[PDB]
């Protein structure tokens with residue numbers, strides 16, 4: 001069962017492109033191990049967590065309500081909108097939109113939530129304002145990461161993402177209720193079964209968020225640990241290859257197995 005760094009390097013040998021990885025201790029924030037920690041990768045759908053962090057920050061500031069209902073029309077729908085496409089008559093609450101963006105990777109939900117904050121540049125401003133001067137969102141879904149490769153637009157680094165996720169889940173950046181709501185949505189993720197979850201032993205906690213481009217890229221962010229409580233953050237990104245989705249998934253699952261077996 002290869003050591004995690006050995007397995008990450010092997011994944012990159014087999015896939016082509018780059019694989020980036022970091023593991024942080026959740027309590028201390030210390031980097032436990034990493035590979036390409038400071039290199040840029042496309043965020044893909046992993047940004048949806050950060051988006052909902054910004055929404056929750058607005059809640060905490062008295063500027064938004066999770067119960068506020070948003071109506072939208074057929075013309076607002078984009079690709080990969082399995083939840084929002086079923087609510088054209090009734091609309092969805094802000095909190096429902098975050099649940100759908102996080103748990104189902106719903107793209108229209110994410111775009112609606114981006115409208116609530118004024119667009120991708122405002123999410124960047126939110127990240128900047130929490131001390132992340134690396135991560136940037138510039139585009140909407142689904143063009144995010146599909147229109148001509150890393151111009152630094154729509155990218156993060158493993159360390160920036162892991163650091164920022166730790167601050168959202170543990171900091172007093174968010175209120176206790178909002179921190180808990182964010183991790184609850186990640187825990188309820190429905191679409192990342194083939195990834196880290198496939199390696200997870202019974203009894204363990206995981207809160208995660210996956211992402212994909214059609215070709216070349218995959219990723220996941222997670223807070224996980226034994227005995228029902230998260231104790232570490234893991235971020236894995238891969239980009240730049242011509243590997244199949246099955247291949248990409250397999251390699252993330254095998255990195256997961258290594259990190260669990262060598263915990």
Ligand SMILES: *[B]([O])([O])[C]([C]C1=[C]C(C([O])=O)=[C][C]=[C]1)[N]C(=O)[C]([N])C1=[C][C]=[C][C]=[C]1
Pocket residue numbers: 044045046079080104105107141142143144146191192209210211212213214215
């Ligand atoms: B997202 O990664 O930006 C988004 C939706 C999506 C999420 C996931 C996941 O694992 O959470 C898997 C697949 C799609 N990506 C896209 O909209 C992207 N254009 C896309 C579209 C089709 C297939 C793969 C990627």
Ligand SMILES: [Ca+2]
Pocket residue numbers: 009012013
């Ligand atoms: Ca290499």
